[PDB]
Write a protein that binds this ligand. Structure first.
Ligand SMILES: Nc1ncnc2c1ncn2[C@@H]1O[C@H](COP(=O)(O)OP(=O)(O)OP(O)(O)=S)[C@@H](O)[C@H]1O
Ligand SMILES: Nc1ncnc2c1ncn2[C@@H]1O[C@H](COP(=O)(O)OP(=O)(O)OP(O)(O)=S)[C@@H](O)[C@H]1O
Lengths: 66, 684
């Protein structure tokens, strides 16, 4: 439903530090492995709002989404 | 069925041009084409540092299958990138996910090896609930699957090398990180693409400056990703500065100001001034529209040029006869010559300008990425920086040798002449106490960052034992604060341009000086979690007072250089020649004379006036009171602090005594006139 807007919607995630590993379970996609493709191609206009020490703890533990 | 829902083609997106031109990488494309054409261990995975375009290698593989420079065994294949997303996303019931994975594998077997599957982030697939480790290992075993993987070097160690029975169904197609020159080539192809997209014209010196400055200053990420980031972000900056002008902002604020003033006055003259400024506004607005129309026509004709190039690539694959000569010799020379006519027309009409990206916008995007002042000197900043000694002689009086060496170091960094294997400077300040080491360094931070203690100040009088190196490096793996780095490396890896001030360095055990050997030599300091930190952009200032008796004994009748020689021998007695060889220049302070103390008294009284005036009281002073403060505050051995505590006593005790007394009225002038032997306030 953001692809059907054609670049019209600026998506605002607050607490981007949270998103890495949201849903990691037995059969999961970790919610960073479903936004790594869509963020990789620029089709999504996500805006991150995180702390600094939460950024050292959570995102730079994971360079592919860093 | 199955291979329509859950997979995303690349060969369609390389056929409809949706992918990017992938330049270079012919070695690794060739090695993947080798590894696909075997009998066992047929599945490759791409393993490299995150950012070097493993997905770009597979997109280029699709472009070479379409362009057909591949060998004959892979002509006519289809590349299906796999989507774990929809596969997992549909399965509400038990076994539905394994049913869908089995259905995809049965249709892969029915497509009979004609399909090369591309699973990026293979470490995601390895866990899916048997689930996907035990189900693809049949097709990974018997060679009927031609999966191609792409994963980080990090997650290949964890989520694959955990299990050998999945580890050895794959190949380390180790994608190298490219050098400077291949980064230049990649940027040339994507210069073509981004000039299509952001309606700009990227100058080629901006490409070579973007490659060099991306290699030198950003050290977090990995080429060629950072160079494409700098190019694309500067092109965004130019599209924004085109899209907005500022002259019309000044004119619009001026006309709405004079409009409100004229409507308030309703002598006039402002109808005439408003009409003239609105005529100016309309003329500049029409010129703005004309330039926007010119750039619109130019970028539409360049888009038509690229559409002609995609159509002639369609004619190169398909092979029409008259379409080749028609498209080429008709469309290309006329569109390119009126492209150049439109380009020189924009060179005529861009006044109000910039539609091209030179090196300067690259430097501005780089200075706003990290914080290193790379950019060219706006003249406020350049006249700010030529007055560097004049900026430091308002919080440091005396001590000219210090301000000379320091201002020389900052000027050598801002011009370009600095050594990119070192920090900017590394000063070893010496001299007996209370002459202005620590306030010189706070004067630097107040100049440079517009704040007094906005700097990384390490107290080197906590490190009196050997085991407290680890407060600044951090913790080695498998210990307590391993999750939290050091204090030096973390607060530099945040902000690469700062002033690291080592407070009174001679107290510590010599091991922290071994850490400083690493720092002052090559700007690197491997912290606890095993990563370097670029210290090539700081000013590691270290203070001391190791020559107090010597400097207070012989600064009279000795010149500067010989004093430096003698205190140099004394510090050599206190340090190892390793460390004092690394130092940029040991500068030497000197104890203060009488007139310097008079000026310091004036400065401290200025901040006292500041305190009591933002309180609300106003104070003047007699010059005799200043002379008594200069005479009581003078002694060599204790520096410029007996002045401050003499000021503290002989003003701040009776004055605060009387302000709390309910005596001294607000608003009136508090005159600090002397008594016969003291200083007192009066009120009249
Ligand atoms: N040699 C290259 N030629 C052309 N474009 C390249 C090249 N290397 C990288 N790129 C571009 O770099 C961007 C991302 O490259 P990728 O290899 O996809 O990054 P990546 O490999 O996915 O890194 P991660 O860790 O997987 S996110 C794309 O815009 C590519 O076009
Ligand atoms: N040359 C100076 N100009 C202005 N203020 C100074 C000067 N020297 C000292 N001060 C004052 O004295 C304090 C700073 O003293 P410092 O010289 O920084 O002490 P130091 O340099 O660390 O030497 P040590 O190691 O403390 S004995 C501040 O209160 C300053 O206002």
């Amino acid at each position: 439903d953001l692809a059907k807007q054609e670049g019209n919607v600026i998506l605002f995630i607050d607490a981007l530090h949270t998103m890495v590993g949201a849903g990691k379970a037995d059969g999961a996609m970790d919610a960073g492995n479903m936004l790594k493709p869509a963020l990789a191609r620029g089709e999504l206009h996500c805006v991150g709002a995180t702390t600094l020490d939460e950024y050292r703890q959570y995102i730079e533990k994971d360079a592919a989404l860093e | 069925q199955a291979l329509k829902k859950y997979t995303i083609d690349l060969t369609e997106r390389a056929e409809q041009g949706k992918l990017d031109p992938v330049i270079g990488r012919d070695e690794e494309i060739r090695r993947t084409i080798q590894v696909l054409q075997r009998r066992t261990k047929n599945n490759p995975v791409l393993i490299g540092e995150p950012g070097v375009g493993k997905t770009a290698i597979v997109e280029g593989l699709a472009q070479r299958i379409i362009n057909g420079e591949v060998p004959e065994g892979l002509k006519g294949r289809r590349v299906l990138a796999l989507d774990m997303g929809a596969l997992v996303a549909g399965a509400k019931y038990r076994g539905e996910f394994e049913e869908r994975l089995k259905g995809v594998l049965n249709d892969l077997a029915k497509q009979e090896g004609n399909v090369i599957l591309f699973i990026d982030a293979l470490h995601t697939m390895v866990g899916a609930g048997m689930d996907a480790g035990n189900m693809l290992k049949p097709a990974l075993a018997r060679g009927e699957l031609h999966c191609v993987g792409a994963t980080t070097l990090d997650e290949y160690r964890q989520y694959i090398e955990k299990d050998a029975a999945l580890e050895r169904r794959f190949q380390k197609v180790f994608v190298a990180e490219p050098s400077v020159e291949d980064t230049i080539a990649i940027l040339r192809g994507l210069k073509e693409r981004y000039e299509l997209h952001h309606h700009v014209q990227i100058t080629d010196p901006a490409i070579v400056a973007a490659a060099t400055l991306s290699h030198r200053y950003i050290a977090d990420r990995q080429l060629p990703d950072k160079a494409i980031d700098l190019i694309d972000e500067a092109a965004s900056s130019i599209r924004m500065q085109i899209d907005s002008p500022e002259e019309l902002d000044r004119l619009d604020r001026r006309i709405i100001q004079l409009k409100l003033e004229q409507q308030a006055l309703m002598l006039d003259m402002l109808n005439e001034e408003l009409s003239d400024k609105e005529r100016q506004y309309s003329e500049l607005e029409e010129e703005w529209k004309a330039e926007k129309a010119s750039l619109s026509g130019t970028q539409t004709i360049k888009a038509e040029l690229e559409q002609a190039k995609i159509a002639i690539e369609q004619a190169r694959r398909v092979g029409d006869l008259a379409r080749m000569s028609e498209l080429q010799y008709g469309k290309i020379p006329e569109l390119e010559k009126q492209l150049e006519a439109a380009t020189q027309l924009e060179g005529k009409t861009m006044r109000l300008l910039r539609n091209k990206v030179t090196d300067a916008e690259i430097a501005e995007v780089l200075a706003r990425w990290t914080g290193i002042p790379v950019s060219r000197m706006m003249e406020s900043e350049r006249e700010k920086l030529l007055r560097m000694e004049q900026e430091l002689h308002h919080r440091v009086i005396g001590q000219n040798e210090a301000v000379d060496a320091v201002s020389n170091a900052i000027r050598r960094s801002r011009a370009g002449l600095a050594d990119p294997n070192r920090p900017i400077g590394s000063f070893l300040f010496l001299g007996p106490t209370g002459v202005g080491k620590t306030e010189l360094c706070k004067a630097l931070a107040n100049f440079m960052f517009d704040s007094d203690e906005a700097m990384v100040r390490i107290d080197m009088s906590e490190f009196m034992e050997k085991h407290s190196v680890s407060r600044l490096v951090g913790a080695p793996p498998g210990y307590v604060g391993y999750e939290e780095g050091g204090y030096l490396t973390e607060a530099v890896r945040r902000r690469p341009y700062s002033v690291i001030l080592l407070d009174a360095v001679e107290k510590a055990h010599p091991d922290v000086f071994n850490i400083l050997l690493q720092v002052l030599d090559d700007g690197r300091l491997t912290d606890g979690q095993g990563r370097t930190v670029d210290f090539r952009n700081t000013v590691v200032i270290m203070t001391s007072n190791l020559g107090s008796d010597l400097i207070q004994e012989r600064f009279g009748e000795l010149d500067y250089a010989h004093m430096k020689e003698l205190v140099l021998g004394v510090v050599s007695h206190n340090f190892r020649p390793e460390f004092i060889n690394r130092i940029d220049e040991v500068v030497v302070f000197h104890p203060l004379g009488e007139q310097h103390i008079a000026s310091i008294a004036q400065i401290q009284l200025k901040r006292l006036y500041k305190r009591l005036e933002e309180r609300g009281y106003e104070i003047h002073i007699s010059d005799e009171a200043l002379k008594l403060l200069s005479e009581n505050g003078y002694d060599p051995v204790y520096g410029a602090r007996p002045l401050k505590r003499a000021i503290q006593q002989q003003i701040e005790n009776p004055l605060a005594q009387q302000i709390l007394s309910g005596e001294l009225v607000p608003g009136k002038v508090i005159r600090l006139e002397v008594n016969e032997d003291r200083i007192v306030a009066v009120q009249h």
